[PDB]
Amino acid sequence: TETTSFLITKFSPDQQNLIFQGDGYTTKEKLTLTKAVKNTVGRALYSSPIHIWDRETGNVANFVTSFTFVINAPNSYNVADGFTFFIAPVDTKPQTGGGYLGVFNSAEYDKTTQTVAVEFDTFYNAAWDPSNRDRHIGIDVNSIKSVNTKSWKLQNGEEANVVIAFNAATNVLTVSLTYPN
Amino acid sequence: VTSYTLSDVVSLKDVVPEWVRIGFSATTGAEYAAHEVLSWSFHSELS
């Protein structure tokens, strides 16, 4: 058995157990991925690698993560591009920005990407996003084109409480987003 | 209290390496917004 756990209920200016990439940085209380500026990318990773599955036994880890995020758009109607929770190789680095969310490079399936992400997409990219044009939660596997989505109404500047759990027994990944109001 | 849930099967073993790093990503393009995280917890167990 190998377990890795952590809890950060409030970020600090000197958050040393985190790796920052792009414009990501911490402040007292919050972790900022991007400011309200055009064409940027910000990422933050937990410092320690995590043993997710083992080739020897073929076992896969059960895991659960919870976080609270806030999207603050200065133009409440024109919002882009979104936020994601991802699981990538240990040497992961920012990928294509904009609609690619800094985690992918195309809408086709790329096994070399080796990334699973759960997106909170705020902008409709015609090339791959749902036709209903709704903002949405999506499960991404090696591609920006989600394998499954759920329309979601963004509450500008409101704290979203999220829980993502993975059941090793059933290979079911569950995402859950809740708002106060 | 508004809530949304989504779920699907993901064969992690065939997509990601044995060891991984986890994190958050957020981007802007021609349009934009501030993306922030207020707290974070994680727990994994591999038998």
Ligand SMILES: OC[C@H]1O[C@H](O)[C@@H](O)[C@@H](O)[C@@H]1O
């Ligand atoms: O920001 C919205 C949109 O702006 C531009 O069109 C590009 O950067 C896209 O990738 C992005 O999705």
Ligand SMILES: [Ca+2]
């Ligand atoms: Ca999009």
Ligand SMILES: [Mn+2]
């Ligand atoms: Mn999308």
